[PDB]
Nucleic acid binder design. Structure first.
Ligand code: 1N7
Ligand code: MG
Ligand code: MG
Ligand code: ZN
Ligand code: ZN
Lengths: 96, 336, 48, 1360
DNA sequence: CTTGACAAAAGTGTTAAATTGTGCTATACTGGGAGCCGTCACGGATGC
DNA sequence: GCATCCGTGAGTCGAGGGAAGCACAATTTAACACTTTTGTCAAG
């Protein structure tokens, strides 16, 4: 919303347009760097004002919310690697 | 499919107690309670422990202290002579009567609970809270006074229902004493509202409350009594907008705020570079740029092996050259 | 049915008071309304 | 490392407790006064972490080095506050509660494992019926109780506690039965009451006691507060008490020795029990349970004779054993959990495998459904009992925040309310259990606890939805958060709000280039702020970035050098313009921003059609790609000037439009004169001589000597275009006057405007010779001729020169339309002189029709039809008269020119302006008998206007309700094909499809050539599978079919040299998870072979779905397409012959039958009376050939004919809808979707495998499994091709993430968690959800690893 | 550079008010109440 | 066979919208003073 100084909604159909174009990196930025990659969006702004290229993005926070909401439903959602070993996307902040 | 209808049907399968039946059950509970005390005094066991064992046996094996210690205590009671075993029988009959007395009065709580609906707790929640008061009524009820059970149980059922509303009807819990104040304030405002033919101001409400009340306290009480608003309340006829969509997150630093903090550190590091190899470490320790916490002059001294006056001289010297370097360059005033 | 008054100009306020809505509490639904309720009936002549 | 797979599985209570950092024991959220979280509450800091970074709750540790330290005063770990978003708690349920996802999701997973119906499971779970777990030798109604039997509450009380009944005696009357006397059923107890069961009759409250002294029948009265302390017939010595009382004054004693007799009982209790008199101490106590052979009293003398609950009566000194059994029956999830714990999945699988051989299909079908659930739990490693929750996980509090708004008010989510009720009910259940509350109270609380869990997990799934008190709005549960259009998937994962994004109204920029846009300065300053701050810091505008940002905060503080820096910032860069709805991929395009003064975005005219954008108030969003990758993708792939052709059809999409066509058509159209128009002469000088006399006009067609020419072609002969256009400037001739011009060495006879158009193309493409070959000079430039010019320029020159040609056409088209003089007046809508004559003829015929009707020669229905035919024929004639008048008398009429050139309008709309409005339809569908005989120029009457409003509303309502249907269809098509990507150059398959060139016409019963647009849509840009030799031209195998090749093939077909073309299509492609380059063909957007890594599945779905809104203007239109894509069985389905043979009609008055006769077979088809048979006697029909008119069932066609026939039918019938509406769509896009529909198969013979008969799995998997089984010499799996709709095909995909984000989120997740499904992140949706690089475009493995290096950084490396 | 003086702030200890939690009240009282159709239509899947 | 239950229905924007009282104990918290660190001024 303009009143809230808000961004433009990049809905599903707009995402499909980037997928059809093949703009994998343009789509990835709008999903992570410009929306909810908290570490990515802070680094992207800092890199630009220093004259550098924006860094490689990271996992979005919305997916982190999805994992936690799925766990609250007693569903064990685990992100694995090539060798099926679990990968911690919370950076050790949720592991006891 | 209706939980309320299902409960009402279940309580309807227990016939209501006549006066003769009610007195017999009340007498048995009173006799059973006394026998438990006699058993505990003779055997030396905890009166609560014997009551649970007697309660556990009466309730049967359909209820999950481990069962082995129940059996050992039960066998110990059964080993007593006939005179002492007679109190075990009275305890068993008393506990069975207590269960029957509670079940046969489940209609009384429903009649009371139906008058508390709409105050923050659902109808079934009101009933179960009232049941807890009904159980306490059975323990405290005395048939010697010849008062009917409905006379005494009503006080305990209403108490449990009213207390539960004060403790569970608000997302942000408010103590009973403050909840009572809010109800009294609402009654006073309502009574004044009809008398004045308009909404009373905080001055009229405060005067009617009595001594110790002013407009400030009435205003604060109303502010406390504000329930939190749901983040999922829709706005507009279209069901696509909610409260949470308009509340910014002011906890996490913004990208601008995070960037200027890193810019400040880089500029501060360059300023500390001009300082001596010894002064910079002292200043960063005193300002907590290394450990994250400030260090007192003695601790900084204990770190380097000098008295407190040395650090206070180094810090005042390191902090003064930075003023000179900053003034002669003006590369650090913007961050302030 | 209690709507923020549309008073861009005098005609705006006049139009709003004369609007007839099939929606609201006790009426049709914006997505559950078929073509029959949305058509111009022959009896709309002179009335709607 | 790097995330490659995502796995979902059931969470055990051990895992749920391992997740939790502490158990939430209290429902308190925060302190109401201090506003700090309460200990053990839903927001507790010791559980979920500190509120603020590196600071305990007790204010003792406030530094970072204490990271990893837990304060010993408050217990709060000293760490980042962001852990509050990630750390979970748990609630330890007093009793287990079933997960509603595994109960109410049909078919129930718990019920399937336990073989319990949905009703049976609900009754047990919600404490309606008991389930037996240990009968303990219980007998019910003479029949022993077996395990897993459901017992109602009445039956359980009977088995567990026995039979008893109390009969209230009337006051005063005395019972006829004594205390402790056995009775039988129906025996009278008192004079007025009779028993209903056999048992021991016991006096309840004896109102009178009669003692007999020996010296004396004294009688004593018993009150309600008095109880008798002695049994009946008891000898009472002097002084012994008889009746006990509260007051000793009213206590009853005995004067002397006597016997006590009890009388006047209040009621009789008849209980089925055994009475055992005893003399010594009893070894049992009240409430114990005994069995035969158990000792009761006297040290073994008295023993139990039957099972039951033992109760000892001290008054009567007898032992009563109420006949009952210690049956183990339980309700709720605790009973279900015990059953699921006891399941032996290995043994259950063996039994189900044994039952899989049952001859009955229903028995086998049921066994497979149970066994699929059993197999899922066995292979995944999950436990069935994990479906019942013992500990409820608690979401991190930052995901369910209780935040304070700027006004001081508190805002919280509904999950806190749902959690509080669960905790409030759980804590109360623990208190009730500790107090030994009766079963009715405990059962009610357990039922609420189960319902509280189900409201938290999925509110409203079972029972009435939970609403916050004081409102009727249902609370949002965890299921609602993840499901629906407002759920996490579709609102926050598949689409997001983005930074560096703006929006403003759009206006037309005619001066812009095709690759440019008008970006307002104020928008660009905010969009490019971080870049601008760096540039401002570089120059002297600001000292640093922070001071630069302060300058931009205030509008009056911005200096004039900032705008100069902003120009430097955006140099070279591009922005993305987006207009919603983004129906196809051209809804987002990249433009080079041009800073303009104002607040509106300037849009190039040529991109309006792709954007579907006009300038009546439209708005667009601006997005700023940030990195070099994002900028490179937009500048190379997404640039507007690079996407000139339509990916859907391959035709130009950025082409001349309304004003551009109008200007170019006007100058290229020639004038026709009528002054001379036929005069013949002897010499040219005579023909010219007449012209100066005024007898013949300049462009009047005359004959000079023998040839037909005009005066203009003789009077004016120009040496070159420069002289011709110089004469135009001097007013000697007009652009529309036909003259003789010497161009390129050929003496042309054309107008200067056509010569001017030739020079327009020649200068734009900078090649006079090639441009001459690209244009059609001898015709006015309409929409289609200009479209052909753009396509030919694209092929011969490329994107760069075509974009230059497009701008030149736009500039001159805009320039000429301004000075040409197009305007619309009331007289421009010319009324034909034939309209009055036609209406008089129609009225006479209409009056003639009525007279025949009044004479009774025709009925109402045929008269109604005949009236409609008359007006339909009259309306068509007026349309002819309207346009015929235009092309004879006003060839340059503004309505005619706009319609003819394609700029605006169609013959239907022109007639309503110029001829008559025509017939109108009632809201019921019928058409009014009287039409609207008045045009818009004459003006409708009041009645005619109201009659016309019926159709206008229906059309408007149709448009509103069709956008939802078209948008839903596109989403289905995306989700079924999103994973299809060109992944390799060639899959090596030798299969193909033979695209037919001739269509089986049935009205003439002959093969006729298909339409050229139809053959192009099925052959353009396709790789030839086999060599074709037509017209002396050898089209080798592997050759991509261009438009020239397609046209050549049609030319050969017209000569009877070829009937069908074998081409490679996605239908026969063997590439897994996509297609190959050679099976797709050309990138219709670039008219060249498709590049590996393109997301053709997304392009195909957008190509099909974009014209859905235009489709609707048996079923036809969009509803026909939807049922075709959903593989639905039509209501009026056609009857097809299952076998081949000759048809034998046996029509009789009674009924209609159709017989197909073969060598030995004879199939009978009982058609209805009103069946439009399309097959006649003496015809040989093949399998799957329709016998009756209608829509063929694709599933019946698949079984009767085969997988290839149903695929061909689906593609052809979907195209019929689009072709009938004028929409051009390549068959590739439909075949990509149909390929996904035919992706699955059904097993018919398990063979030497573990697969089940009737199991559905992907065709690739079974073929791969089959070739594997052959390798080790085993019987292969026999399968059967299967067809399913786009929704069913999408929902049965292998990846659970994409399926859950599409629909049936609860159903998809509940199956995936049980099966432990691992998502390999193969398609596009899964990578989009995780924010990864999609495996398409620049993210495809084919191109992602490409390296770039110069010849000096490479040469030095080569040395080492 | 350290010693000592020197004092302001910060840190323990008591402790009174202020606040919060818990128990109790005895004529007799014993099975709820809001909803209530333009019920949305339609395809699919299950079931008996 | 049919009844019956379940999930589905375009996008962006926009603005407006935002009915108990008491006693008594138990715990918590403001209020206070004394001593202990820390900080500072002098001196040599
Ligand atoms: C052929 C001629 C140069 C001859 C030569 O260099 N020798 C070139 C050089 C510059 C060209 C014009 C400008 O581009 C502006 C404009 C662009 C539109 O697209 C088409 C119209 C305009 C007027 C162009 C026409 C034509 O194309 C010109 C005159
Ligand atoms: Mg528009
Ligand atoms: Mg001449
Ligand atoms: Zn702490
Ligand atoms: Zn292929």
């Amino acid at each position: 919303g303009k009143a809230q100084f808000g961004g433009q909604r990049f809905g599903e159909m707009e995402v499909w347009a980037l997928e059809a174009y093949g703009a994998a990196h343009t789509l990835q930025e709008m999903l992570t760097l410009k929306s909810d990659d908290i570490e990515g969006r802070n680094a992207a702004y800092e890199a630009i004002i220093k004259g550098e290229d924006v860094p490689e993005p990271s996992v979005p926070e919305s997916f982190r919310v999805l994992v936690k909401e799925l766990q609250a439903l007693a569903l064990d959602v685990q992100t694995l690697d090539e060798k099926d070993n679990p990968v911690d996307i919370f950076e050790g902040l949720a592991s006891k | 499919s209706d939980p309320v209808r299902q409960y009402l049907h279940e309580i309807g399968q227990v016939p209501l107690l006549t006066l003769e039946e009610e007195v017999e059950l009340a007498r048995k509970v009173e006799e059973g309670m006394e026998a438990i005390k006699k058993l505990s005094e003779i055997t030396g066991l905890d009166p609560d422990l014997i009551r649970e064992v007697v309660r556990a046996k009466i309730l049967g094996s359909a209820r999950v202290l481990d069962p082995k210690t129940v059996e050992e205590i039960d066998q110990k009671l059964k080993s007593l002579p006939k005179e002492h075993k007679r109190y075990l029988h009275i305890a068993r009959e008393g506990e069975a009567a207590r269960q029957h007395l509670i079940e046969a009065n489940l209609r009384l709580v429903v009649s009371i609970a139906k008058k508390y609906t709409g105050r923050g707790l659902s109808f079934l929640d009101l009933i179960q809270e009232g049941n807890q008061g009904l159980i306490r009524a059975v323990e405290k009820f005395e048939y010697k006074r010849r008062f009917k059970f409905s006379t005494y149980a009503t006080w305990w059922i209403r108490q449990a229902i009213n207390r539960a509303i004060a403790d569970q009807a608000r997302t942000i819990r408010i103590p009973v004493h403050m909840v009572e104040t809010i109800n009294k304030l609402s009654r006073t405002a309502r009574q004044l509202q009809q008398e004045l033919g308009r909404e009373p101001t905080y001055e009229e409400i405060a005067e009617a409350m009595g001594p110790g009340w002013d407009a400030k306290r009435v205003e604060e009480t109303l502010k406390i009594a504000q329930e939190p608003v749901s983040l999922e309340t829709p706005i507009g006829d279209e069901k696509d907008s909610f409260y949470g969509d308009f509340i910014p997150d002011e906890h996490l630093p913004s990208p601008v705020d995070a960037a200027t903090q890193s810019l400040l550190s880089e500029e501060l590091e360059k300023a500390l570079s001009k300082l001596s190899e010894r002064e910079a470490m002292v200043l960063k320790l005193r300002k907590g740029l290394i450990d994250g916490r400030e260090h007192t002059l003695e601790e900084v001294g204990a770190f380097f092996g000098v008295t407190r006056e040395r650090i206070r001289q180094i810090e005042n010297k390191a902090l003064r050259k930075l003023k000179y370097h900053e003034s002669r360059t003006r590369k650090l005033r913007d961050f302030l | 049915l209690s709507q923020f008054k549309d008073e861009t100009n005098p005609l705006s306020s006049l139009r709003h008071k004369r609007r007839i809505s099939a929606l609201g509490p006790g009426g049709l639904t914006r997505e559950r309304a078929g073509f029959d309720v949305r058509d111009v009936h022959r009896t709309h002549y002179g009335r709607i | 490392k790097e995330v490659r797979k995502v796995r979902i599985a059931l969470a055990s209570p051990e895992k749920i407790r391992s997740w939790s950092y502490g158990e939430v024991e209290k429902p308190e959220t925060i302190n109401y006064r201090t506003l700090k979280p309460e200990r053990d509450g839903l927001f507790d800091e010791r559980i979920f972490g500190p509120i603020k970074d590196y600071e305990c709750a007790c204010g003792k540790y406030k530094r970072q080095r204490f990271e990893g330290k837990v304060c010993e005063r408050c217990g709060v770990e000293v760490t980042k506050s962001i852990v509050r978003r990630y750390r979970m708690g748990h609630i330890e349920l007093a009793t287990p509660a079933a997960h509603i996802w595994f109960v109410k999701d049909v078919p129930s997973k718990i019920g399937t494992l336990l073989d319990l119906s949905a009703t049976e499971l609900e009754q047990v779970l919600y404490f309606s019926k008991y389930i037996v777990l240990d009968p303990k030798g219980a007998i019910l109604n003479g029949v022993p109780v077996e395990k897993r039997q459901l017992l109602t509450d009445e039956e359980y009380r009977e088995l567990r506690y026995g039979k008893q009944e109390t009969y209230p005696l009337p006051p005063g009357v005395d019972a006829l039965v004594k205390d402790g006397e056995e009775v039988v059923k129906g025996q009278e107890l008192a004079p007025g009451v009779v028993s209903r069961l056999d048992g021991v009759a016991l006096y309840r409250f004896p109102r009178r006691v009669r003692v007999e002294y020996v010296k004396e029948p004294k009688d004593y009265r018993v009150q309600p507060h008095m109880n008798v302390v002695v049994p009946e017939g008891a000898r009472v010595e002097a002084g012994d008490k008889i009746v006990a009382a509260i007051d000793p004054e009213e206590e009853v004693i005995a004067e002397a020795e006597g016997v006590v007799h009890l009388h006047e009982p209040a009621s009789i209790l008849v209980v089925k029990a055994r009475v055992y008199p005893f003399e010594d101490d009893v070894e049992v106590s009240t409430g114990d349970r005994v069995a035969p052979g158990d000792v009761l009293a006297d040290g073994g003398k008295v023993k139990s004779d039957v099972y039951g609950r033992v109760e000892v009566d001290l008054v009567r000194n007898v032992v009563r054993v109420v006949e009952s059994y210690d049956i183990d029956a339980r309700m709720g999830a605790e009973a279900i959990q015990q059953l699921l714990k006891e399941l032996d999945l290995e043994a259950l699988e063996k039994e189900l495998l044994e039952e899989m051989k049952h001859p009955s299909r229903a028995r086998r079908a049921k066994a497979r459904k149970r066994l699929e659930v059993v197999r899922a739990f066995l292979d995944s490693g999950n436990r069935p009992e994990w479906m019942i929750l013992e500990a409820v996980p608690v979401l991190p509090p930052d995901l369910r925040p209780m935040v304070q708004v700027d006004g001081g008010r508190f805002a919280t989510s509904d999950l806190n309310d749902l959690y509080r009720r669960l905790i409030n009910r759980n804590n109360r259940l623990k208190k009730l259990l500790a107090q030994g509350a009766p079963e009715i109270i405990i059962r009610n609380e357990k039922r609420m606890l189960q319902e509280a869990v189900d409201a938290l997990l999925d509110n409203g799934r079972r029972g009435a939805p939970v609403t916050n008190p004081g409102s009727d709005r249902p609370l949002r549960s965890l299921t609602d958060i993840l499901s629906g259009k407002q759920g996490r998937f579709r609102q926050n994962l598949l689409g997001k709000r983005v930074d560096y994004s703006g929006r403003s109204v759009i206006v037309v920029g005619p001066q812009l280039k095709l690759h440019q846009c008008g970006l307002p300065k104020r928008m660009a300053l905010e969009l490019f702020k971080p870049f601008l701050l760096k540039k401002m810091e570089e120059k002297g505008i600001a000292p640093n970035v922070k001071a630069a940002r302060r300058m931009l905060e205030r509008q009056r503080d911005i200096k004039d050098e900032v705008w100069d820096a902003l120009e430097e910032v955006i140099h070279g860069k591009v922005v993305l313009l987006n207009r919603a709805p983004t129906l196809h991929r051209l809804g987002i395009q990249a433009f080079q921003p041009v800073l303009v003064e104002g607040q509106s975005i300037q849009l190039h005219p040529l991109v309006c059609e792709a954007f579907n954008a006009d300038f009546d108030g439209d708005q667009m969003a601006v997005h700023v790609p940030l990195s070099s990758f994002a900028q490179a993708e937009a500048r190379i792939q997404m640039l507007s000037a690079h996407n000139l052709l339509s990916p859907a059809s391959g035709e130009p999409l950025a082409k001349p439009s309304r004003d551009i066509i109008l200007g170019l058509y006007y100058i290229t159209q020639v004038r026709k004169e009528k002054k001379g128009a036929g005069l013949e002469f002897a010499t040219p000088e005579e023909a010219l001589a007449a012209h100066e006399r005024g007898e013949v006009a300049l462009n009047a067609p005359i004959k000079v000597a023998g040839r037909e020419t005009s005066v203009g072609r003789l009077k004016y002969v120009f040496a070159n275009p420069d002289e011709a256009l110089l004469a135009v400037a001097h007013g000697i001739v007009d652009l529309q006057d036909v003259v003789t011009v010497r161009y390129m060495g050929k003496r042309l006879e054309t107008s200067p405007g056509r010569i001017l158009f030739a020079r327009i193309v020649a200068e734009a493409v900078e090649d006079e010779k090639v441009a001459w070959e690209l244009i059609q000079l001898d015709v006015p430039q309409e929409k289609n001729s200009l479209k052909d010019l753009v396509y030919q320029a694209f092929l011969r020159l490329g994107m760069e020169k075509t974009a230059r040609l497009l701008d030149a056409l736009k500039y001159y088209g805009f320039t000429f339309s301004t000075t040409s003089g197009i305007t619309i007046g009331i007289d421009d809508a010319v009324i034909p002189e034939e309209k009055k004559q036609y209406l008089e003829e129609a009225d006479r015929k209409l009056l003639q029709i009525e007279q025949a009707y009044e004479m009774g020669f025709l009925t109402d229905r045929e008269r109604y039809d005949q009236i409609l035919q008359l007006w339909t024929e009259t309306t068509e004639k007026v349309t002819q008269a309207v346009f015929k008048n235009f092309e004879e008398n006003y060839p340059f009429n503004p309505l005619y020119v706009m319609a003819q050139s394609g700029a605006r309008g169609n013959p239907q709309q022109i007639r309503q302006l110029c001829g008559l409005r025509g017939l109108m339809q009632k809201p019921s569908g019928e058409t009014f008998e009287v039409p609207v005989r008045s045009s818009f120029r004459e003006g409708l009457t009041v009645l005619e206007y109201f009659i016309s409003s019926h159709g206008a509303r229906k059309g408007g309502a149709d448009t509103a309700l069709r956008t939802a249907d078209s948008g839903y269809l596109t989403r289905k098509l995306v989700d079924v094909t999103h994973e299809i990507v060109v992944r390799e150059a060639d899959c090596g398959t030798t299969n193909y499809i033979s695209v037919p060139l001739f269509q089986p016409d049935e009205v003439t019963r002959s093969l006729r050539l298909r339409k050229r647009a139809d053959i192009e849509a099925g052959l353009y840009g396709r790789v030839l599978a086999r060599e074709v030799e037509v017209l002396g031209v050898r089209l080798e195998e592997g050759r991509y079919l261009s438009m020239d090749d397609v046209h050549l093939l049609i030319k050969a077909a017209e000569a009877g040299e070829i009937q069908e073309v074998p081409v490679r299509s996605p239908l026969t492609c063997q590439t897994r998870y996509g297609v190959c380059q050679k099976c797709y063909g050309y990138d219709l957007s670039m008219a060249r072979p498709v590049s590996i890594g393109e997301a053709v599945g997304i392009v195909a779905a957008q190509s099909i779905g974009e014209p859905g809104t235009q489709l609707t203007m048996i079923t036809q239109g969009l509803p026909r397409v939807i049922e075709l894509f959903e593989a639905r069985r039509p209501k009026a389905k056609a009857v097809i012959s299952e076998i081949d043979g000759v048809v034998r009609i046996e029509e009789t008055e009674e009924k209609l039958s159709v017989f197909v006769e073969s060598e030995g077979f004879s199939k009978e088809y009982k058609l209805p009376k009103e069946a439009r048979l399309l097959v006649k006697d003496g015809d040989y029909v093949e399998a799957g050939q329709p016998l009756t008119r209608g829509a063929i069932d694709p599933h019946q066609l698949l079984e009767a004919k085969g997988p290839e026939a149903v695929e061909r039918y689906l593609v052809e019938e979907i195209q019929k809808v689009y072709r009938a509406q004028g929409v051009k769509l390549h068959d590739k896009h439909i075949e990509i979707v149909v390929r996904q529909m035919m992706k699955y198969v059904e097993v018919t013979d398990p063979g030497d495998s573990r697969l089940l008969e009737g199991q559905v799995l992907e065709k690739w998997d079974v073929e791969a499994l089959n070739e594997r089984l052959i390798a080790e010499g085993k019987t292969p799996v026999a399968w059967k091709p299967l067809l399913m709709g786009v929704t069913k095909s999408a929902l049965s995909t292998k990846s659970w993430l994409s399926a859950a984000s599409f629909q049936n989120t609860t159903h998809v997740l509940t199956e995936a968690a049980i099966a432990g499904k691992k998502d390999e992140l193969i398609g596009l949706k899964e990578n989009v959800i995780l924010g990864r690089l999609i495996p398409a475009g620049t993210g495809s493995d084919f191109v992602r690893f490409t390296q770039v290096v110069d010849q000096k950084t490479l040469k030095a490396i080569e040395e080492a």
